[PDB]
Amino acid sequence: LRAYNEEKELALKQRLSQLPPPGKAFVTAKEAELAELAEIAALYKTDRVGILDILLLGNKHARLYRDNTALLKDYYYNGRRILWEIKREGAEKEDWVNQMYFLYAPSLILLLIVMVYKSREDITFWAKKELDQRVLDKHPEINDAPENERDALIVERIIAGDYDKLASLQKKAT
Amino acid sequence: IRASFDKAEEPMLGDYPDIDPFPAQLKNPYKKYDDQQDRRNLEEPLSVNDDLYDMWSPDRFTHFKNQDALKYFIGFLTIFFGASYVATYFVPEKAAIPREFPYEGLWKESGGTEKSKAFFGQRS
Amino acid sequence: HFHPYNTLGLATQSAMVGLGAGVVAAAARNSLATGPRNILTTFSKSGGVVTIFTGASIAYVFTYCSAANLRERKDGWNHMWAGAATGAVLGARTKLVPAFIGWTVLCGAACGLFGWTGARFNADRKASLEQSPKGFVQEDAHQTFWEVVHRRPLSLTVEQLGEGRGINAVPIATATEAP
Amino acid sequence: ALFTSLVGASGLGFATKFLSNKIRLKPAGYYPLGYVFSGVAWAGLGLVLHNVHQHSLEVLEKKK
Amino acid sequence: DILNEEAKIVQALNNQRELTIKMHELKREEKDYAHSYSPLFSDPVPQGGSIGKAPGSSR
Amino acid sequence: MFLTSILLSSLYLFNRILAWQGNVKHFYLFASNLLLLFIVVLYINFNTFSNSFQFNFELFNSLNPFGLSNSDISNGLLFGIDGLSLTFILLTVLLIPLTLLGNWYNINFNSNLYYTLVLAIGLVILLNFWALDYISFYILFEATLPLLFILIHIYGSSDSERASFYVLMFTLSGSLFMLLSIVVISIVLNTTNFINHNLFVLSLDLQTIIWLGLFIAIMVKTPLFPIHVWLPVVHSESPLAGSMILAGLILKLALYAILRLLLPLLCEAQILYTPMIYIISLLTIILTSLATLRQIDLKVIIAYSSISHMGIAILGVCSNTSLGIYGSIVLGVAHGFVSPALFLIVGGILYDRYHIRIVNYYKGLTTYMPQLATYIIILSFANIGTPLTGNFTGEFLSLQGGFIRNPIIGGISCISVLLAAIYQLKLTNKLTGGISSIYMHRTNDVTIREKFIMNILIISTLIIGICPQIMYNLLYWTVNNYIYII
Amino acid sequence: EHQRPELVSFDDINYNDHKKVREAQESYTREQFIRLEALKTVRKALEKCYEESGPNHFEDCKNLAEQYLDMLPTHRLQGYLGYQRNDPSK
Ligand SMILES: CCCCCCCCCCC(CCCCCCCCCC)(CO[C@H]1O[C@@H](CO)[C@H](O[C@@H]2O[C@@H](CO)[C@H](O)[C@@H](O)[C@@H]2O)[C@@H](O)[C@@H]1O)CO[C@H]1O[C@@H](CO)[C@H](O[C@@H]2O[C@@H](CO)[C@H](O)[C@@H](O)[C@@H]2O)[C@@H](O)[C@H]1O
Ligand SMILES: CCCCCCCCCCCCCCCCCC(=O)OC[C@H](COP(=O)(O)OCCN)OC(=O)CCCCCCCCCCCCCCCCC
Ligand SMILES: CCCCCCCCCCCCCCCCCC(=O)OC[C@H](COP(=O)(O)OCCN)OC(=O)CCCCCCCCCCCCCCCCC
């Protein structure tokens, strides 16, 4: 539930009405006219919005706000192009970087994480264990072998026996 | 217009100026063009089918004629494989027998079964 | 099976029909026009229509009957060859070769598309859903066109597809059995 | 269900009033009781078509 | 618990398929003279034009 | 009442962001980004052990027209996923914030129109891959075309009239024959359905002549040889978003539709008629990858590159073998990464800077843009099919699957590695090398957003190129669901 | 927990119920992966035979090499639509 001010929001338009257009206010290739603008351009940045203030108001405030922001935007970016204005530090955060680094990128990493650990349940990893269980069901005496010996005593059954039971689903064939 | 494909595009152009296509490489380099890299003045009319006559086009040798060059290449290809084939008739014979192996030709060592002894095994 | 066609008889019938069509079209062209015209300019300022209606009508049915006789069957291909001949007649009015080749290819393809569907502007009464057995089959019946079954016989699919690619007269696993 | 079949036809009504405002070059909410009028009218059309479909289903049920 | 929720949908589509086959067969079914035409006055039989009528005209 | 209340709240929030903020670039980004958070949680609850369709819903049923329905009689519009259907949704949803981002600082005139059209023709191609009837697949197979027509006509570069007419005309002209072949199997079977049609056989004389109506319908959409008239000249005049979403999403749809529609009820009509598919796919690979050499324009080259890779892909599908199906899927998921990155390079970055797309102006890009010439080279060498990039895994398996089915056509078609190297490296060394050009003032380096897009579209190729198995957990049923080798 | 669902043939399961049809599809599929793991196990054994044998691999496991080249045409994925759409002996 952030805040705004109404009378400041009217006085800002009263301030802007006497100002030159954005296509003129910076095309003079200092501080007589360029010093009022370097504060007004920071009125774009100063972040008076309101979280719950957008919900609980009428459109009379909304149109007034929207026209004021649409002029402060030009006074910021035109002065950024020709010339706070007269500084240089990096990097001035943009408009898209909040919901591409903090919603797009972590969901897009979470997608990689889920794809890696969903690959654990695979048909090869299940078919190997099912084939070993099918060996140990018919011939459970190789369970009595030691733990190191069983991995070579299953393979002699696999190589030896068929153990596939595909021709038993095809009883119409023979 | 020199090549047979440049001639075959005369009825398409209607307002195109139809200039003479000349390679960008065979221009001299010592004239100071706008583009020293590609040998081309700033507003110079490009040819019908330019990108065979670009600097980035093929190398386009200029010493031999291409027809002659074809004859010389196939001439070397012929004089190698003809001489090396005729020289197989003038070969001398060997002084040794091929060597021999035990165990009925090592049929069992390189695979094999008693019925299958023909495919595997050498020089009993 | 079939019966061969009288090429000369069908061609001279179509020649008479093309004659009558050329006459009625020249009579239509006189009256649906402007400027000074009389009885004699029926065939003077005719636009050359009676040659169109005559030549197309001869060439189509002559090529059609000839193609149906030398192939000894009737399908949509005969309409393709006959429409190619019709495009040859209609292409010669514009005395240019790539035009002519285009007329012969495209009119022949359009007439072949007409012939393949049944060579009819209307429908066939029988052999369509409202008047043909459709739905599932009831017993081990020969599955006709328009019908569905659940499992085709393997001896039928080996006759239709072949004995090559992956399809075989015995499935591959019971072909490799322990006894 | 009857209720969603009312709410959807009422939403069609809100779309009619909205688009009729936007052809006349008015704002979105111009005469905001007119949304209530169109919602009730098109919802009544949903009532009618819902009941006709009910009775048609019952006529099909009675044929067995 | 998903094979069952498929069997439900496939039954719900085979029911609609049999519904269509029925309602497409119920169109082509021939209809009575009392359903198709005038419900009362169910006969097609005229007795038309009785003022100067002649005995022996019925058949 | 609850899900109605969510909509009545969200439309109000949309209204108030329309009122105070001017653009809805931020709320379209927020919505299209939350689509990821939704679809990944759908991926978590996806049972991979079942061939079955997991998440099913009918819209527009009789008993409930505005919403969901649970009845014993269904005539609405079915929707659901498995596997196959889900890899392409995951391809989609991580790309649509990138095209929505892709024109961020660009539009300047009726931006609210443009981003609405782009987001809408992305949501329609989500629900393409959700669909389950033949009609519900088809009623969104051309809900794209209106908004594509108007997105090309307005906002197209120059001579966008003709391109907009082509994207309506060619797609529609090939699409009506698909409508014919859908009508025929909806009056024979009386079912539009993607679940039951494995059961239904047809007569070979019926199955023969309805495969034509779908094959010369996908011949237009993945542009095969009597088509691809329209592909480069819809690209070359498109805007930036409608080129990425065309070449990354609209093309792979018919790769999905040859799997979903054709292969499992046309089973016996294909094995007679695959060696026409091999003719057409080979002489798109031989012909359209050879007309790339003589191209003056710079976006048209990447257009014909898309044609050549989609011609490799459909001789992996039509192999009736097990490696080719998975190879064509990994082609469709990796070309949809590497190719819109190339459209960001050609009409994305370079047309924003210099506004003319002729090749002849552009040389010496290295001396003033080093960290763009890197993205020229690694992304080109990803398009050719260097290994470890995910394009080679697909090219390799699809050439192998097309080598099983007919080995002479596979041996001839193997030359595509050469033919795809020729034009791409010829373009790369014209752009990368030489003295920085005369015509060209030095402009900005590639900026933070046009790196943020690129590194996503490069890592997402490299992960598939290092492990193509990260999506075998989805696809291993659909490797089997389409083989008819008895 | 390694679950083992049942085997359902396509023969006599009445292709009007989608329960037994889909289980028959998945069962023929899963048994086909099992049929493949025998190929993938003999290949793993043949390579160990080769690497330990060294020069006499020609005669130590001629049987395993010929074994692997016998299984290779007939242990792969083949499709349930071949056996579902067609019946032998009809
Ligand atoms: C999607 C774009 C693709 C365009 C395809 C359009 C062309 C489709 C044509 C094929 C089709 C319509 C089927 C269309 C259904 C879907 C149409 C889909 C969209 C339509 C746009 C028209 O078939 C026509 O084919 C022509 C040439 O092939 C013939 O030409 C002519 O030949 C000469 C006289 O024969 C004339 O003297 C000559 O003047 C013409 O030359 C015609 O005779 C024939 O009627 C086939 O219909 C027919 O097929 C036959 C089996 O063959 C069926 O009978 C069967 O008999 C037993 C045999 O096993 C079995 O008991 C059983 O199997 C079945 O009982 C029929 O029931 C019937 O149905
Ligand atoms: C029988 C045994 C077989 C064994 C081989 C037999 C000999 C085969 C020899 C030919 C094969 C060589 C590989 C083909 C690619 C050639 C590429 C090439 O050479 O590009 C070089 C060219 C610039 O090089 P250059 O200007 O000369 O450099 C001078 C530096 N001072 O750069 C360029 O700008 C060239 C751009 C065009 C590249 C060539 C395009 C045509 C390629 C022909 C391939 C044929 C495919 C036909 C497919 C039909 C299939 C049915
Ligand atoms: C142009 C004509 C085409 C048809 C009109 C266009 C479609 C209109 C939008 C309707 C379709 C999507 C929205 C509603 C269906 C999904 C949400 C839902 O409520 O159902 C939950 C869904 C399936 O339902 P179920 O799993 O059975 O659980 C319900 C138990 N009662 O459980 C799930 O698995 C969720 C699946 C959601 C994914 C849907 C596809 C994502 C794309 C959404 C696009 C929506 C476009 C809306 C545009 C808004 C503009 C104001």
Side-chain angles (χ1 to χ4, degrees), chain C residues 64 74-76 79 115-117 127 144-146, chain F residues 180 184 205 209 213:
Chain C
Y64 180 77
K74 294 188 248 185
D75 58 3
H79 295 281
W116 184 48
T117 62
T144 62
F145 185 83
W146 294 110
Chain F
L180 270 73
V184 175
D205 289 332
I209 61 176

PDB file of all heavy atoms in Angstrom, chain C residues 64 74-76 79 115-117 127 144-146, chain F residues 180 184 205 209 213, ligand 1:
ATOM      1  N   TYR C  64      -9.186 -39.231 -76.846  1.00  0.00           N
ATOM      2  CA  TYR C  64      -9.764 -40.001 -75.752  1.00  0.00           C
ATOM      3  C   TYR C  64     -10.030 -41.437 -76.158  1.00  0.00           C
ATOM      4  O   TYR C  64      -9.665 -42.369 -75.437  1.00  0.00           O
ATOM      5  CB  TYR C  64     -11.063 -39.359 -75.294  1.00  0.00           C
ATOM      6  CG  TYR C  64     -11.716 -40.089 -74.160  1.00  0.00           C
ATOM      7  CD1 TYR C  64     -11.240 -39.953 -72.879  1.00  0.00           C
ATOM      8  CD2 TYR C  64     -12.815 -40.909 -74.369  1.00  0.00           C
ATOM      9  CE1 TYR C  64     -11.838 -40.603 -71.832  1.00  0.00           C
ATOM     10  CE2 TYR C  64     -13.406 -41.575 -73.329  1.00  0.00           C
ATOM     11  CZ  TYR C  64     -12.909 -41.417 -72.063  1.00  0.00           C
ATOM     12  OH  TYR C  64     -13.492 -42.067 -71.008  1.00  0.00           O
ATOM     13  N   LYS C  74     -10.330 -48.096 -68.845  1.00  0.00           N
ATOM     14  CA  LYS C  74     -10.980 -46.800 -68.708  1.00  0.00           C
ATOM     15  C   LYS C  74     -10.736 -46.263 -67.310  1.00  0.00           C
ATOM     16  O   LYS C  74     -11.235 -46.826 -66.332  1.00  0.00           O
ATOM     17  CB  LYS C  74     -12.480 -46.910 -68.961  1.00  0.00           C
ATOM     18  CG  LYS C  74     -12.842 -47.284 -70.369  1.00  0.00           C
ATOM     19  CD  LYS C  74     -14.321 -47.172 -70.589  1.00  0.00           C
ATOM     20  CE  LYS C  74     -14.976 -48.498 -70.797  1.00  0.00           C
ATOM     21  NZ  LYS C  74     -16.409 -48.295 -71.123  1.00  0.00           N
ATOM     22  N   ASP C  75     -10.000 -45.165 -67.218  1.00  0.00           N
ATOM     23  CA  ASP C  75      -9.760 -44.525 -65.936  1.00  0.00           C
ATOM     24  C   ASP C  75      -9.603 -43.030 -66.182  1.00  0.00           C
ATOM     25  O   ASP C  75      -9.981 -42.519 -67.240  1.00  0.00           O
ATOM     26  CB  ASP C  75      -8.575 -45.202 -65.221  1.00  0.00           C
ATOM     27  CG  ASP C  75      -7.282 -45.187 -66.027  1.00  0.00           C
ATOM     28  OD1 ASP C  75      -7.229 -44.617 -67.130  1.00  0.00           O
ATOM     29  OD2 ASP C  75      -6.292 -45.777 -65.551  1.00  0.00           O
ATOM     30  N   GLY C  76      -9.050 -42.323 -65.210  1.00  0.00           N
ATOM     31  CA  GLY C  76      -8.904 -40.899 -65.386  1.00  0.00           C
ATOM     32  C   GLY C  76      -7.769 -40.473 -66.274  1.00  0.00           C
ATOM     33  O   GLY C  76      -7.675 -39.286 -66.583  1.00  0.00           O
ATOM     34  N   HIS C  79      -8.825 -39.105 -69.809  1.00  0.00           N
ATOM     35  CA  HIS C  79      -9.227 -37.714 -69.771  1.00  0.00           C
ATOM     36  C   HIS C  79      -8.026 -36.786 -69.694  1.00  0.00           C
ATOM     37  O   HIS C  79      -8.093 -35.670 -70.211  1.00  0.00           O
ATOM     38  CB  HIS C  79     -10.174 -37.496 -68.608  1.00  0.00           C
ATOM     39  CG  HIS C  79     -11.466 -38.228 -68.755  1.00  0.00           C
ATOM     40  ND1 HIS C  79     -12.486 -37.779 -69.562  1.00  0.00           N
ATOM     41  CD2 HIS C  79     -11.890 -39.397 -68.227  1.00  0.00           C
ATOM     42  CE1 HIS C  79     -13.494 -38.628 -69.505  1.00  0.00           C
ATOM     43  NE2 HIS C  79     -13.157 -39.621 -68.704  1.00  0.00           N
ATOM     44  N   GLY C 115     -11.330 -36.211 -64.686  1.00  0.00           N
ATOM     45  CA  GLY C 115     -11.563 -37.605 -65.020  1.00  0.00           C
ATOM     46  C   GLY C 115     -11.297 -38.563 -63.878  1.00  0.00           C
ATOM     47  O   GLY C 115     -11.902 -39.636 -63.807  1.00  0.00           O
ATOM     48  N   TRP C 116     -10.409 -38.190 -62.962  1.00  0.00           N
ATOM     49  CA  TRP C 116     -10.042 -39.132 -61.922  1.00  0.00           C
ATOM     50  C   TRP C 116     -11.143 -39.280 -60.887  1.00  0.00           C
ATOM     51  O   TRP C 116     -11.300 -40.340 -60.283  1.00  0.00           O
ATOM     52  CB  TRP C 116      -8.745 -38.705 -61.268  1.00  0.00           C
ATOM     53  CG  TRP C 116      -8.350 -39.690 -60.317  1.00  0.00           C
ATOM     54  CD1 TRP C 116      -8.309 -41.036 -60.525  1.00  0.00           C
ATOM     55  CD2 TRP C 116      -7.844 -39.470 -58.973  1.00  0.00           C
ATOM     56  NE1 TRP C 116      -7.856 -41.645 -59.400  1.00  0.00           N
ATOM     57  CE2 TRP C 116      -7.565 -40.723 -58.432  1.00  0.00           C
ATOM     58  CE3 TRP C 116      -7.623 -38.352 -58.193  1.00  0.00           C
ATOM     59  CZ2 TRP C 116      -7.069 -40.902 -57.136  1.00  0.00           C
ATOM     60  CZ3 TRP C 116      -7.113 -38.527 -56.943  1.00  0.00           C
ATOM     61  CH2 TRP C 116      -6.877 -39.810 -56.402  1.00  0.00           C
ATOM     62  N   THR C 117     -11.930 -38.235 -60.676  1.00  0.00           N
ATOM     63  CA  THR C 117     -12.956 -38.303 -59.644  1.00  0.00           C
ATOM     64  C   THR C 117     -14.161 -39.099 -60.105  1.00  0.00           C
ATOM     65  O   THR C 117     -14.941 -39.585 -59.284  1.00  0.00           O
ATOM     66  CB  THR C 117     -13.378 -36.907 -59.266  1.00  0.00           C
ATOM     67  OG1 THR C 117     -13.934 -36.290 -60.425  1.00  0.00           O
ATOM     68  CG2 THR C 117     -12.176 -36.127 -58.827  1.00  0.00           C
ATOM     69  N   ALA C 127     -22.699 -46.065 -54.652  1.00  0.00           N
ATOM     70  CA  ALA C 127     -21.278 -45.929 -54.318  1.00  0.00           C
ATOM     71  C   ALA C 127     -20.963 -44.571 -53.685  1.00  0.00           C
ATOM     72  O   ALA C 127     -20.069 -43.855 -54.127  1.00  0.00           O
ATOM     73  CB  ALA C 127     -20.391 -46.192 -55.541  1.00  0.00           C
ATOM     74  N   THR C 144     -15.444 -53.933 -47.617  1.00  0.00           N
ATOM     75  CA  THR C 144     -15.532 -53.121 -48.805  1.00  0.00           C
ATOM     76  C   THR C 144     -15.058 -51.714 -48.478  1.00  0.00           C
ATOM     77  O   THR C 144     -14.775 -51.379 -47.330  1.00  0.00           O
ATOM     78  CB  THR C 144     -16.958 -53.134 -49.336  1.00  0.00           C
ATOM     79  OG1 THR C 144     -17.833 -52.568 -48.364  1.00  0.00           O
ATOM     80  CG2 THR C 144     -17.393 -54.554 -49.642  1.00  0.00           C
ATOM     81  N   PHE C 145     -14.951 -50.886 -49.512  1.00  0.00           N
ATOM     82  CA  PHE C 145     -14.752 -49.451 -49.385  1.00  0.00           C
ATOM     83  C   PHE C 145     -15.905 -48.874 -48.576  1.00  0.00           C
ATOM     84  O   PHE C 145     -16.991 -49.455 -48.529  1.00  0.00           O
ATOM     85  CB  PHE C 145     -14.677 -48.867 -50.795  1.00  0.00           C
ATOM     86  CG  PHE C 145     -14.365 -47.428 -50.881  1.00  0.00           C
ATOM     87  CD1 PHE C 145     -13.080 -46.967 -50.816  1.00  0.00           C
ATOM     88  CD2 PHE C 145     -15.365 -46.544 -51.137  1.00  0.00           C
ATOM     89  CE1 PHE C 145     -12.824 -45.638 -50.967  1.00  0.00           C
ATOM     90  CE2 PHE C 145     -15.120 -45.206 -51.233  1.00  0.00           C
ATOM     91  CZ  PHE C 145     -13.849 -44.757 -51.157  1.00  0.00           C
ATOM     92  N   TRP C 146     -15.639 -47.756 -47.898  1.00  0.00           N
ATOM     93  CA  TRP C 146     -16.484 -47.033 -46.935  1.00  0.00           C
ATOM     94  C   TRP C 146     -16.607 -47.688 -45.577  1.00  0.00           C
ATOM     95  O   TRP C 146     -17.222 -47.092 -44.696  1.00  0.00           O
ATOM     96  CB  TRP C 146     -17.928 -46.764 -47.393  1.00  0.00           C
ATOM     97  CG  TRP C 146     -18.039 -45.842 -48.543  1.00  0.00           C
ATOM     98  CD1 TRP C 146     -18.394 -46.156 -49.746  1.00  0.00           C
ATOM     99  CD2 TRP C 146     -17.827 -44.451 -48.529  1.00  0.00           C
ATOM    100  NE1 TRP C 146     -18.386 -45.075 -50.583  1.00  0.00           N
ATOM    101  CE2 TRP C 146     -18.045 -43.987 -49.829  1.00  0.00           C
ATOM    102  CE3 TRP C 146     -17.482 -43.535 -47.522  1.00  0.00           C
ATOM    103  CZ2 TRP C 146     -17.934 -42.662 -50.155  1.00  0.00           C
ATOM    104  CZ3 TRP C 146     -17.348 -42.189 -47.858  1.00  0.00           C
ATOM    105  CH2 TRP C 146     -17.580 -41.770 -49.165  1.00  0.00           C
TER     106      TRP C 146
ATOM    107  N   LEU F 180     -10.701 -30.786 -46.395  1.00  0.00           N
ATOM    108  CA  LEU F 180     -11.342 -31.874 -47.145  1.00  0.00           C
ATOM    109  C   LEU F 180     -11.054 -33.223 -46.524  1.00  0.00           C
ATOM    110  O   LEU F 180     -11.972 -34.010 -46.268  1.00  0.00           O
ATOM    111  CB  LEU F 180     -10.864 -31.952 -48.589  1.00  0.00           C
ATOM    112  CG  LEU F 180     -11.432 -31.278 -49.809  1.00  0.00           C
ATOM    113  CD1 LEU F 180     -11.031 -29.924 -49.628  1.00  0.00           C
ATOM    114  CD2 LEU F 180     -10.795 -31.896 -51.082  1.00  0.00           C
ATOM    115  N   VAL F 184     -13.742 -35.920 -44.710  1.00  0.00           N
ATOM    116  CA  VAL F 184     -13.960 -37.288 -45.176  1.00  0.00           C
ATOM    117  C   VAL F 184     -13.840 -38.284 -44.035  1.00  0.00           C
ATOM    118  O   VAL F 184     -14.689 -39.160 -43.875  1.00  0.00           O
ATOM    119  CB  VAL F 184     -13.004 -37.631 -46.320  1.00  0.00           C
ATOM    120  CG1 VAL F 184     -13.149 -39.059 -46.695  1.00  0.00           C
ATOM    121  CG2 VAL F 184     -13.336 -36.782 -47.488  1.00  0.00           C
ATOM    122  N   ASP F 205      -8.053 -48.358 -50.522  1.00  0.00           N
ATOM    123  CA  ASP F 205      -8.481 -47.379 -51.510  1.00  0.00           C
ATOM    124  C   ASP F 205      -9.052 -46.115 -50.879  1.00  0.00           C
ATOM    125  O   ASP F 205      -9.077 -45.077 -51.543  1.00  0.00           O
ATOM    126  CB  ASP F 205      -9.491 -47.993 -52.474  1.00  0.00           C
ATOM    127  CG  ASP F 205      -8.858 -48.994 -53.408  1.00  0.00           C
ATOM    128  OD1 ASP F 205      -7.653 -48.847 -53.696  1.00  0.00           O
ATOM    129  OD2 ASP F 205      -9.565 -49.925 -53.848  1.00  0.00           O
ATOM    130  N   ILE F 209      -6.456 -42.190 -50.618  1.00  0.00           N
ATOM    131  CA  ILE F 209      -6.828 -40.924 -51.220  1.00  0.00           C
ATOM    132  C   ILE F 209      -7.285 -39.901 -50.193  1.00  0.00           C
ATOM    133  O   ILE F 209      -7.835 -38.870 -50.570  1.00  0.00           O
ATOM    134  CB  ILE F 209      -7.903 -41.134 -52.280  1.00  0.00           C
ATOM    135  CG1 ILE F 209      -9.111 -41.733 -51.613  1.00  0.00           C
ATOM    136  CG2 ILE F 209      -7.430 -42.106 -53.349  1.00  0.00           C
ATOM    137  CD1 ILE F 209     -10.218 -41.870 -52.532  1.00  0.00           C
ATOM    138  N   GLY F 213      -4.768 -35.489 -49.173  1.00  0.00           N
ATOM    139  CA  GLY F 213      -5.295 -34.240 -48.666  1.00  0.00           C
ATOM    140  C   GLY F 213      -4.607 -33.732 -47.428  1.00  0.00           C
ATOM    141  O   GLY F 213      -4.691 -32.536 -47.145  1.00  0.00           O
TER     142      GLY F 213
HETATM  143  C1  LIG H   1      -8.155 -34.952 -51.015  1.00  0.00           C
HETATM  144  C2  LIG H   1      -7.751 -34.548 -52.446  1.00  0.00           C
HETATM  145  C3  LIG H   1      -7.617 -35.845 -53.283  1.00  0.00           C
HETATM  146  C4  LIG H   1      -8.681 -35.885 -54.417  1.00  0.00           C
HETATM  147  C5  LIG H   1      -9.319 -37.308 -54.476  1.00  0.00           C
HETATM  148  C6  LIG H   1     -10.601 -37.241 -55.358  1.00  0.00           C
HETATM  149  C7  LIG H   1     -10.702 -38.545 -56.254  1.00  0.00           C
HETATM  150  C8  LIG H   1     -11.320 -39.723 -55.380  1.00  0.00           C
HETATM  151  C9  LIG H   1     -11.881 -40.903 -56.252  1.00  0.00           C
HETATM  152  C10 LIG H   1     -12.061 -42.425 -55.924  1.00  0.00           C
HETATM  153  C11 LIG H   1     -13.586 -42.774 -55.974  1.00  0.00           C
HETATM  154  C12 LIG H   1     -14.361 -41.864 -54.958  1.00  0.00           C
HETATM  155  C13 LIG H   1     -13.859 -42.050 -53.483  1.00  0.00           C
HETATM  156  C14 LIG H   1     -13.716 -40.609 -52.907  1.00  0.00           C
HETATM  157  C15 LIG H   1     -13.851 -40.616 -51.366  1.00  0.00           C
HETATM  158  C16 LIG H   1     -13.037 -39.444 -50.735  1.00  0.00           C
HETATM  159  C17 LIG H   1     -12.825 -38.216 -51.668  1.00  0.00           C
HETATM  160  C18 LIG H   1     -11.949 -37.192 -50.882  1.00  0.00           C
HETATM  161  C19 LIG H   1     -12.028 -35.739 -51.417  1.00  0.00           C
HETATM  162  C20 LIG H   1     -12.649 -35.663 -52.825  1.00  0.00           C
HETATM  163  C21 LIG H   1     -12.215 -34.365 -53.534  1.00  0.00           C
HETATM  164  C22 LIG H   1     -14.111 -42.466 -57.431  1.00  0.00           C
HETATM  165  O1  LIG H   1     -13.677 -43.556 -58.247  1.00  0.00           O
HETATM  166  C23 LIG H   1     -13.646 -43.259 -59.514  1.00  0.00           C
HETATM  167  O2  LIG H   1     -12.213 -43.440 -60.047  1.00  0.00           O
HETATM  168  C24 LIG H   1     -12.104 -43.184 -61.504  1.00  0.00           C
HETATM  169  C25 LIG H   1     -10.667 -43.474 -61.947  1.00  0.00           C
HETATM  170  O3  LIG H   1      -9.918 -44.005 -60.877  1.00  0.00           O
HETATM  171  C26 LIG H   1     -13.058 -43.951 -62.358  1.00  0.00           C
HETATM  172  O4  LIG H   1     -13.029 -43.226 -63.687  1.00  0.00           O
HETATM  173  C27 LIG H   1     -14.000 -43.610 -64.605  1.00  0.00           C
HETATM  174  O5  LIG H   1     -13.931 -45.068 -64.894  1.00  0.00           O
HETATM  175  C28 LIG H   1     -14.967 -45.588 -65.838  1.00  0.00           C
HETATM  176  C29 LIG H   1     -15.996 -46.394 -65.092  1.00  0.00           C
HETATM  177  O6  LIG H   1     -15.390 -47.084 -64.021  1.00  0.00           O
HETATM  178  C30 LIG H   1     -15.671 -44.506 -66.668  1.00  0.00           C
HETATM  179  O7  LIG H   1     -16.277 -45.092 -67.835  1.00  0.00           O
HETATM  180  C31 LIG H   1     -14.669 -43.479 -67.056  1.00  0.00           C
HETATM  181  O8  LIG H   1     -15.323 -42.491 -67.916  1.00  0.00           O
HETATM  182  C32 LIG H   1     -14.001 -42.788 -65.912  1.00  0.00           C
HETATM  183  O9  LIG H   1     -12.662 -42.467 -66.321  1.00  0.00           O
HETATM  184  C33 LIG H   1     -14.416 -44.142 -61.761  1.00  0.00           C
HETATM  185  O10 LIG H   1     -15.023 -45.414 -62.179  1.00  0.00           O
HETATM  186  C34 LIG H   1     -14.477 -44.300 -60.281  1.00  0.00           C
HETATM  187  O11 LIG H   1     -15.838 -44.217 -59.885  1.00  0.00           O
HETATM  188  C35 LIG H   1     -13.774 -44.323 -55.656  1.00  0.00           C
HETATM  189  O12 LIG H   1     -15.156 -44.664 -55.467  1.00  0.00           O
HETATM  190  C36 LIG H   1     -15.470 -45.983 -55.800  1.00  0.00           C
HETATM  191  O13 LIG H   1     -14.374 -46.830 -55.400  1.00  0.00           O
HETATM  192  C37 LIG H   1     -14.653 -48.251 -55.646  1.00  0.00           C
HETATM  193  C38 LIG H   1     -13.298 -48.841 -55.398  1.00  0.00           C
HETATM  194  O14 LIG H   1     -12.466 -48.501 -56.469  1.00  0.00           O
HETATM  195  C39 LIG H   1     -15.800 -48.727 -54.725  1.00  0.00           C
HETATM  196  O15 LIG H   1     -16.382 -50.036 -55.108  1.00  0.00           O
HETATM  197  C40 LIG H   1     -15.777 -51.144 -54.522  1.00  0.00           C
HETATM  198  O16 LIG H   1     -15.911 -52.369 -55.338  1.00  0.00           O
HETATM  199  C41 LIG H   1     -15.023 -53.442 -54.827  1.00  0.00           C
HETATM  200  C42 LIG H   1     -13.582 -53.132 -55.166  1.00  0.00           C
HETATM  201  O17 LIG H   1     -12.715 -53.657 -54.179  1.00  0.00           O
HETATM  202  C43 LIG H   1     -15.211 -53.674 -53.321  1.00  0.00           C
HETATM  203  O18 LIG H   1     -16.481 -54.324 -53.159  1.00  0.00           O
HETATM  204  C44 LIG H   1     -15.262 -52.425 -52.507  1.00  0.00           C
HETATM  205  O19 LIG H   1     -13.912 -51.906 -52.235  1.00  0.00           O
HETATM  206  C45 LIG H   1     -16.134 -51.361 -53.059  1.00  0.00           C
HETATM  207  O20 LIG H   1     -17.495 -51.780 -52.912  1.00  0.00           O
HETATM  208  C46 LIG H   1     -16.956 -47.816 -54.765  1.00  0.00           C
HETATM  209  O21 LIG H   1     -17.715 -47.910 -53.512  1.00  0.00           O
HETATM  210  C47 LIG H   1     -16.740 -46.363 -55.065  1.00  0.00           C
HETATM  211  O22 LIG H   1     -16.843 -45.623 -53.850  1.00  0.00           O
END
